[PDB]
Design a protein around this ligand. Sequence first.
Ligand SMILES: Cc1ccc(Sc2cc(C(=O)N3Cc4ccccc4C3)ccc2O)cc1C
Length: 208
Amino acid sequence: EVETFAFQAEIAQLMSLIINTFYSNKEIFLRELISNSSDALDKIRYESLTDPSKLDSGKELHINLIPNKQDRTLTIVDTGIGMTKADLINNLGTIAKSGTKAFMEALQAGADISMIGQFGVGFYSAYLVAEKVTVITKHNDDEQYAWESSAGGSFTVRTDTGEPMGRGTKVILHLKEDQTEYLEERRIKEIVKKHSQFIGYPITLFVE
Ligand SMILES: Cc1ccc(Sc2cc(C(=O)N3Cc4ccccc4C3)ccc2O)cc1C
């Protein structure tokens, strides 16, 4: 059973701006998603210090980048704390509202789209390169969920019956047809070294 939700108006406006504005420096999406993975990994590691059983769902803390040219997907997998249903359908949108308004106002003051992560809404930079984003996520003591959106003001959430993840988040970027450079080994490596050089978890770039 699939539930369909409306983005809050401010977040829909942000996604439209990301999709419609001319902006050539699209590669920043990868830094923003890796940063989110790193923050999620930080949090499970921190919480496991007072409750070690939180690592029963998996002790390894890492980030994997997986291109698939046949499916035209770039997938980013981490074993961080994951997201609850409440995060997905209600609570993260509430935090995104204030960040979006601030980011909007910064853009009119002369800020650049690459600063999106300073306003806590860097995830939506995925829409610089993806026509559809599918997010599989598993938080301890909650179900595995699949979040999905092709923008247009709505997203879906369902309980996911695919391959169990144990714990963490998997962001599946269905790339636009003119954005397949982000499937190339040399290009991904270039971007990670330039923008994500000091991330404190092993990042593995899969090849095909
Ligand atoms: C709603 C939403 C928000 C971010 C993303 S992208 C995204 C989210 C996560 C995740 O599970 N997090 C992020 C974070 C930072 C701090 C603390 C805890 C947690 C949990 C990890 C990697 C990502 O690339 C996707 C969606 C669907």
